[PDB]
Structure formats: structure tokens, C-alpha cells
């Protein structure tokens, strides 16, 4: 008797808030169905899991530098002098049922967040989804990326182990006291004295759990609101114009897909956090100034910054009894890639002199210069990332450690140019690949062997034919083209039935008839709509 | 008060069509499995989330002169071995130099 139950609780809501038209509008919103548009939500689904795991790791952690003696369950560190933060981090992993699993899922989700953001950024850049009126959204996303990087960096510095301590001494302390005028003032303001201090871990904890996630949440909210009210772009195709959206309604197709995708992302993250080990802090020790190991690697989203330090030469200046260290060059450099990233749309708008309120995307093959620039940037990023782990590559692969530095140093000026050239040529060649099929047709891969001994290939025209049998040339419309005959339906179903036993013939015939008729109806509907639009 | 009849009728038709067109109600087997599976997953997840900070308060952890005993049964005055001498000490000050004397 749920018909009477739902009819009563529906009237109670409409008589008090009257949200009929307002929710009816939201149930009818149309969203394009392209795989590439699912890249953005993964990050979102990664953020939520980072919040649930962040609340479960807030019931057991104690951020303090007060030095203690362990005397716990883990025997190899029995009697060692550590801090309260490190001891509590060991307690989470060894004394609480399922704590190791939770913190492993936390770290894995942290990695997925950054990876997803990078892929989403690549998608947005390459398809020209930033042009107009979607510049502010690009800017917001850029700020989100920067905040995500710094949020991640402050996270693994909390356990206060040897790796994180060595990283934070070199990055946050060494670089800080190199800035020309405000070098030592800023250092003493941040640390409240010399490097180790007694307030750094509490400050980082308060910064990591409260402030940066709050700013991230606000910015994400703004991002999603802008996307919702600016009517997501689409791609060129049959029935697509500058002033419409083609896809499916929110209720019920879109919501089910979103829920299923969230479930599968959660499944993958949970499965990955049990079978693979990440961040074993017990194999390390408590941070000591007079101790170090061989690796010394930050997380992959911070690797390019560390690799830039390793490759830049030792150039310093000494004016009037002062010092300008090497570390300055990176601090200027690091903030120069950011500035060039946020204000890219304006640069391109000024260069090409185009601002015409675009709603239709671009295929990367159609814009060679932008594609080449993106490829060059990706190449530089990859080289800087692989330069940070030049000591691990030199060990596992037999190559000199001195040789890797020079390889990277020379490469960071040579490899981008090669990538630019190759990308440009490749894009133009992919363009030329499309003009061959609009003019001659799809090559079926069949040879004919005419009576007089000539070999020809059978082509399948994509449009009307001429009186001589040669196809009428078609125009390019910014849409993909078929290149295989199997994708055009040159192949039926093997037969209705199970994997081992067939079904009665009549069922198979009826099902084939229905499917074929449904395909006719869909194509006809699209064609009719496209014909009525352009009258 | 109440939104016009047109909005109410259209929104109700939309929701009803979404539910009815899915043909979910006609399929009892898969509609029941979904509920059972979701319930099982929820129960497992909730027990895993909460079961980490539950401790037994009646477990013997305190060494005494009569074996290990629970915390609430013991104090600083319980003998640890037979014939142990426990003094009544006063506290005055001197945080680092004998805060307790006979």
C-alpha cells in the first residue's frame, strides 16, 4: 500500500515549500553521454573518500613533538626515543583493528585524486573547453590543482618519520631561507624559531584538517555550480548545434550511471588498499638530524619540483657581502609555471584574436599548434618527473648516476622541441587521413582482379554516388569518420541462445527484426530533427 | 501554499514514468537481491567502521598478588605480592627531589 503512502507524503511537501516546477526543471536537465566527460567526477569521488577516511584518522592521532620512549607491541623499535606523532601513527597501524587498512586507503585515494585532476586538466586543455564563456572555471580549477598539491604535501609530513623529515628540512626550510630580502624573517615566522622548533606539527595538523580542505570544498562547490548553470559543452556530430544539448535526462538514466560509477571507484580504491603496501612507517625510524637514507623521494605530484632542483646548475651571486643561493632559481621558476598556467586562455585569446562564445568542442587533430604546445609541456613534465628518481633508475638499470644528471640537463631543452615538431606533423597527417575517406570512401580490404588483369580495391561510399560509380565528395563537419567495415554492421549476431545451446528459431527472427527496426527508428528520428533544424 | 495543478501533474507524471518504465517492479528476483546485497554491505561496513574502538572493560590486565584482575577492581593500594609494605606518604612540593616522604 505504498501508492497511498507516497501520495500523502508528496502532498505534505508541496503544500509547505511548493517545489514542483523547481524540481521538475532539475529532473529534465540533459547531459551529453561521452566517456571523456566522466573524467571530472572521479576526482570528486576521490575527494569524498578522502573526507570519510580523514574523519576516521581524527579519532586516534596526536600531533605533538613531545619526545617519548616507545615501549609498545612492535618489537624492533622497543626502547627507541621518538615523538608523540610517530608513536600515535604506529598505534593506528598496530593497535587499532583495521587502522592500517584505513590509512592505506587514505593514501591511495590521495594519489588517485591528483592523477584524476591531471587527466581532467589534459582533457579540458586539448578540446578547447576553456575558451568562452568558461575562463573563470579554468582559473578556479587551476587554484584547485595547486591547493591539492599542497594539501597532499602537508599530509604525509604528519607521521614525522625519516623520509618526511628529510623532505621537509630540504624543501620547506632550505628553500625558504634563500629568498633575497625576506629570507630569514619568513623562516622564523613560519617555524617560530629555528628549523625543528616545537609548533610545526600542530600547525601543519590544523592547516591540513581544517583550512585547506575548507577552501577546497568551497572552490569545488563553485566549480560544480558554474558547470551546472552554464550547460556543459558537447562535441560536433549529427543533430548537434551551437544552441542545443543532446544526451539523456537526469532522471533516471544519468543518476543510475553516476551512482554505479561511484560504487565502482569505491570498489577499486578499497580493493587496491588491501593488496598493495603504501607508506610503511615502521621500516623507517623517527626523524633524526644526523640520519638519512638513499631514496629521498616525494610523492609523484611533487616530483617535478624536486627534479628541477637536481638539474639546475650551481649558479650563485655575492653582491656587497650578501648571498643569492641556487635555491632561488627554482622558487622563481616554480611560480612562473603557475602564472603561465592560470592565465593561459587570455594569452591565447590575445594571440589568435578570437573570442566568439564557443559551445562546440574541437578535436585535437584540428588544432595543431595547441596540440603541439600541450605535447611539449607534457614531455617537459615527464622528463622532470623521471629526473627526481634518477638514483633509483641508475641502481635498477645499469647506468651511471653522473650520466643521468647530464642526460636530464641536456634533455630539458632538446626533447620538448622534438616533441613539438612530431606532434605538429602527426596532427596534420591525421587531418589528411580524414580527407581520403570523404573523397573515395571506406576501404573494405577486398581486391577484385578485373578481367584484363587489373587489381583494384572495393570502396564503400558514405553518401550519394555519381553516374559513373565514383562517390560524390563530402564536406568535413568536425565529426569522426568510420574506417572499418565491421563498425558499419558488416556482421550479424551469431545466433540467439546461451553459450552452449541455441534457442528456437522464431525467437531469434523476432528479436533480430525488433532490433533492426529500432535502429531504423533512432536514425530516422535524428535525421528528421537535423533536417528540421536547418530550414 | 500549493503550486498550480499543471506543475504538480507534470512532476508526478515524470516520477511515475521513471519508476514504471524501468520495469523494476515486475522483476521480483533482482529487486530483492539488490536490497539484500545493500543491507549486507552496509552492515559489514558499519561494523568495520565502528568495531575498531570497542574494548572489553572486564579483561585482566592489572598484575596483583592473586593473579591478573580488571582495572576497576584495583587501585594503588592493592598488594602486588604477599607481605608487601605500602607506606602512607605525604606530598609537600619539591617536584624533582623526593615529592613523597614517610
Amino acid at each position: 500500500d505504498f501508492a497511498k503512502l507516497a501520495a500523502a507524503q508528496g502532498d505534505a511537501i508541496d503544500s509547505r515549500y511548493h517545489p514542483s516546477a523547481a524540481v521538475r526543471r532539475q529532473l529534465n536537465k540533459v547531459f551529453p553521454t561521452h566517456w571523456s566527460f566522466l573524467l571530472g567526477e572521479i576526482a570528486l569521488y576521490s575527494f569524498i573518500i578522502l573526507l570519510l577516511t580523514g574523519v576516521w584518522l581524527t579519532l586516534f592521532f596526536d600531533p605533538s613533538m613531545a619526545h617519548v620512549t616507545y615501549d609498545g607491541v612492535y618489537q624492533p623499535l622497543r626502547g627507541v626515543q621518538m615523538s608523540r606523532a610517530y608513536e600515535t601513527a604506529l598505534d593506528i597501524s598496530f593497535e587499532v583493528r583495521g587502522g592500517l587498512f584505513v590509512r592505506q586507503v587514505h593514501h591511495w585515494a590521495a594519489l588517485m585524486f591528483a592523477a584524476s585532476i591531471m587527466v581532467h586538466l589534459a582533457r579540458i586543455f586539448f578540446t578547447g573547453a576553456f575558451r568562452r564563456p568558461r575562463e573563470a572555471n579554468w582559473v578556479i580549477g587551476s587554484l584547485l590543482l595547486i591547493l591539492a598539491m599542497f594539501e597532499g604535501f602537508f599530509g604525509y609530513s604528519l607521521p614525522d618519520d625519516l623520509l618526511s623529515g628529510t623532505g621537509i628540512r630540504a624543501a620547506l626550510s632550505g628553500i625558504t631561507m634563500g629568498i633575497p630580502v625576506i629570507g630569514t624573517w619568513m623562516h622564523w615566522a613560519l617555524f617560530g624559531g629555528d628549523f625543528p622548533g616545537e609548533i610545526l606539527i600542530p600547525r601543519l595538523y590544523a592547516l591540513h584538517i581544517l583550512l585547506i580542505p575548507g577552501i577546497i570544498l568551497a572552490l569545488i562547490g563553485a566549480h560544480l555550480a558554474l558547470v551546472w548553470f552554464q550547460k556543459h559543452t558537447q562535441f560536433p556530430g549529427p543533430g548537434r548545434t551551437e544552441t542545443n544539448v543532446v544526451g539523456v535526462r537526469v532522471m533516471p538514466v544519468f543518476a543510475v550511471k553516476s551512482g554505479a560509477f561511484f560504487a565502482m571507484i569505491t570498489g577499486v580504491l578499497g580493493l587496491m588498499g588491501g593488496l598493495l603496501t603504501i607508506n610503511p612507517i615502521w621500516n623507517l625510524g623517527p626523524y633524526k638530524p644526523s640520519q638519512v637514507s638513499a631514496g629521498s623521494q616525494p610523492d609523484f605530484y611533487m616530483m617535478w619540483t624536486d627534479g628541477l632542483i637536481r638539474l639546475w646548475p650551481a649558479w650563485e651571486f655575492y653582491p656587497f657581502g650578501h648571498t643569492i643561493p641556487q635555491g632561488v632559481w627554482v622558487a622563481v621558476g616554480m611560480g612562473l609555471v603557475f602564472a603561465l598556467l592560470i592565465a593561459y586562455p587570455f594569452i591565447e585569446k590575445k594571440v589568435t584574436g578570437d573570442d566568439a562564445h564557443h559551445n562546440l568542442l574541437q578535436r585535437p587533430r584540428d588544432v595543431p599548434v595547441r596540440t603541439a604546445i600541450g605535447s611539449m609541456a607534457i614531455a617537459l613534465y615527464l622528463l622532470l618527473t623521471f629526473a627526481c628518481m634518477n638514483d633509483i633508475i641508475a641502481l635498477k638499470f645499469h647506468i651511471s648516476l653522473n650520466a643521468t644528471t647530464w642526460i636530464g640537463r641536456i634533455g630539458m631543452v632538446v626533447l620538448p622541441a622534438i616533441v613539438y615538431f612530431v606532434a605538429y606533423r602527426w596532427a596534420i597527417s591525421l587531418q589528411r587521413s580524414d580527407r581520403e575517406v570523404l573523397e573515395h570512401g571506406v576501404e573494405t580490404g577486398i581486391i577484385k582482379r578485373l578481367p584484363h588483369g587489373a587489381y583494384v580495391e572495393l570502396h564503400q561510399p558514405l553518401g550519394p554516388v555519381d553516374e559513373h560509380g565514383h562517390p560524390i565528395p563530402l564536406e568535413y563537419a568536425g565529426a569522426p569518420l568510420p574506417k572499418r567495415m565491421n563498425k558499419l554492421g558488416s556482421g550479424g549476431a551469431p545466433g540467439t541462445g546461451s553459450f552452449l545451446f541455441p534457442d528456437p528459431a522464431v525467437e531469434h527472427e523476432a528479436l533480430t527484426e525488433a532490433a533492426h527496426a529500432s535502429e531504423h527508428k533512432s536514425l530516422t528520428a535524428l535525421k528528421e530533427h537535423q533536417d528540421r533544424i536547418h530550414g | 501554499g500549493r503550486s498550480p495543478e499543471v506543475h504538480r501533474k507534470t512532476v508526478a507524471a515524470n516520477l511515475t514514468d521513471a519508476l514504471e518504465g524501468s520495469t523494476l517492479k515486475r522483476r521480483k528476483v533482482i529487486g530483492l537481491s539488490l536490497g539484500i546485497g545493500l543491507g549486507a554491505f552496509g552492515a559489514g561496513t558499519l561494523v568495520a567502521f565502528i568495531g575498531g574502538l570497542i574494548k572489553n572493560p572486564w579483561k585482566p590486565v592489572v598484575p596483583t598478588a592473586e593473579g591478573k584482575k580488571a582495572v576497576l577492581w584495583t587501585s594503588g593500594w592493592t598488594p602486588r605480592f604477599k607481605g608487601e609494605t605500602i607506606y602512607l606518604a605525604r606530598a609537600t612540593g619539591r617536584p624533582g627531589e623526593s615529592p613523597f616522604v614517610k
Binding site: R25, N28 | V6, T10, V11, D17
Partner: peptide
């Protein structure tokens, strides 16, 4: 602008059409 009399004379099929047409 259908009246209250006509809205009771429509099936579930054409009410969804009307809602969609209102929303665009």
C-alpha cells in the same frame, strides 16, 4: 494553458511531453 478539467483527461504519456515542452 490547460484547465483543471483537461489535466484529468490526459494520460501519463502526454503529461511528460507537456512537462518537457515547458522546460524546453
Amino acid at each position: 494553458q490547460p484547465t483543471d478539467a483537461e489535466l484529468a483527461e490526459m494520460s501519463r504519456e502526454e503529461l511528460v511531453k507537456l512537462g518537457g515542452k515547458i522546460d524546453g
